[PDB]
Amino acid sequence: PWVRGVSSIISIYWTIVKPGDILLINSTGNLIAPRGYFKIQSGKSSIMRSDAHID
Amino acid sequence: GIFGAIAGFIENGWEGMVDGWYGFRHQNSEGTGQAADLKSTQAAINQITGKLNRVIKKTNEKFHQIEKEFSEVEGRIQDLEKYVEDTKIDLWSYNAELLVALENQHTIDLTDSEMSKLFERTRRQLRENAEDMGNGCFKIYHKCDNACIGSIRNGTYDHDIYRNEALNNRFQIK
Ligand SMILES: *[C@@H]1O[C@H](CO)[C@@H](O[C@@H]2O[C@H](CO)[C@@H](O[C@H]3O[C@H](CO[C@H]4O[C@H](CO)[C@@H](O)[C@H](O)[C@@H]4O)[C@@H](O)[C@H](O[C@H]4O[C@H](CO)[C@@H](O)[C@H](O)[C@@H]4O[C@H]4O[C@H](CO)[C@@H](O)[C@H](O)[C@@H]4O)[C@@H]3O)[C@H](O)[C@H]2NC(C)=O)[C@H](O)[C@H]1NC(C)=O
Ligand SMILES: *[C@@H]1O[C@H](CO)[C@@H](O[C@@H]2O[C@H](CO)[C@@H](O[C@@H]3O[C@H](CO)[C@@H](O)[C@H](O[C@H]4O[C@H](CO)[C@@H](O)[C@H](O)[C@@H]4O)[C@@H]3O)[C@H](O)[C@H]2NC(C)=O)[C@H](O)[C@H]1NC(C)=O
Ligand SMILES: *[C@@H]1O[C@H](CO)[C@@H](O[C@@H]2O[C@H](CO)[C@@H](O)[C@H](O)[C@H]2NC(C)=O)[C@H](O)[C@H]1NC(C)=O
């Protein structure tokens, strides 16, 4: 589908790497590479859908 | 009424008694009067405040739960997410509905308890010196001025010093 000049598309994938684990990337091409990592945790954190004015 | 006092043998509540919940209203040679009974008033209030405090307490913060509105059709995994939440809500609504019902019935009934508790306390206080008229009032068979009435309320009424007079007034013919 044509999106802003392009008739192509990128598939997005995610990976978690534990301490002591290693991220290993073998690619022969078509790789949209990572520039680094997000620090991922878990807690009093969420998300909500709303159009309510924040005041 | 369960204890049968409020809307049972007492005809009406006193709209003009705004200094308490339960109380006394009287007539004697020195006129008429009215004053609240702070013991039974406070007792009902304490019980209700207690359960009120106990109902109205907070819960745990809840943080990142599941999605409950869906913009697209996903079938089986969405079906379940919807089913879980719906189940939950029905159960919580039920609990709430039932809670209020039980609590309210109990509040109705405990306040009726306090009414009869006060009445019986007085009936015992007065021994053989007065008779139950049926409507929540007593017929006192001796002269009982405002000071006398103020010994009945306040529980400082020695029946024995009136006993003699009362018995003579109770046991005549007509
Ligand atoms: C497989 O099948 C699909 C469907 O048949 C097909 O998809 C089609 O792909 C082509 C090209 O990839 C694409 O072409 C035009 O896309 C732009 C959108 O056209 C839409 O315009 C409206 C939205 O604004 C929309 O309502 C219409 O209904 C229409 O669909 C269109 O702007 C493009 O035109 C610019 O680009 C071409 C070069 O690609 C120039 O030649 C044009 O002159 C024009 O350029 C001008 O404008 C730009 C700025 O807009 C400017 O920078 C430039 O200098 C110049 O001034 C395209 O003509 C179709 O839209 C798309 N169709 C659908 C339905 O998606 C695939 O291509 C098929 N695959 C193969 C291999 O054939
Ligand atoms: C995973 O990572 C490894 C990291 O090394 C990577 O290994 C490389 O694989 C390529 C592909 O086999 C090797 O390149 C070959 O080397 C020689 C000369 O360069 C040739 O054998 C091959 O050329 C072929 O090209 C022709 C054109 O089609 C063919 O027709 C013909 O058969 C030729 O043989 C090819 O270039 C490369 O040597 C290794 N690297 C090392 C260090 O050994 C591997 O490819 C990665 N996996 C992927 C990308 O899927
Ligand atoms: C009833 O008992 C209470 C005991 O506290 C007495 O209450 C007093 O009432 C008088 C009015 O008659 C007030 O002037 C006092 O301030 C009250 N004292 C307190 C501590 O509340 C009361 O005197 C007793 N009843 C009678 C008829 O005397």
UniProtKB/TrEMBL annotation, chain B:
Keywords: Clathrin- and caveolin-independent endocytosis of virus by host, Clathrin-mediated endocytosis of virus by host, Disulfide bond, Fusion of virus membrane with host endosomal membrane, Fusion of virus membrane with host membrane, Glycoprotein, Hemagglutinin, Host cell membrane, Host membrane, Host-virus interaction, Lipoprotein, Membrane, Palmitate, Signal, Transmembrane, Transmembrane helix, Viral attachment to host cell, Viral envelope protein, Viral penetration into host cytoplasm, Virion, Virus endocytosis by host, Virus entry into host cell. One of its GO terms (biological process) is clathrin-dependent endocytosis of virus by host cell. One of its GO terms (molecular function) is host cell surface receptor binding. It is found in: Host apical cell membrane; Virion membrane. Glycans are attached at N154. Homotrimer of disulfide-linked HA1-HA2. Binds to sialic acid-containing receptors on the cell surface, bringing about the attachment of the virus particle to the cell. This attachment induces virion internalization of about two third of the virus particles through clathrin-dependent endocytosis and about one third through a clathrin- and caveolin-independent pathway. Plays a major role in the determination of host range restriction and virulence. Class I viral fusion protein. Binds to sialic acid-containing receptors on the cell surface, bringing about the attachment of the virus particle to the cell. This attachment induces virion internalization either through clathrin-dependent endocytosis or through clathrin- and caveolin-independent pathway. Plays a major role in the determination of host range restriction and virulence. Class I viral fusion protein. Responsible for penetration of the virus into the cell cytoplasm by mediating the fusion of the membrane of the endocytosed virus particle with the endosomal membrane. This is Hemagglutinin. It comes from Influenza A virus. The lineage of its organism: Viruses, Riboviria, Orthornavirae, Negarnaviricota, Polyploviricotina. The gene is HA.
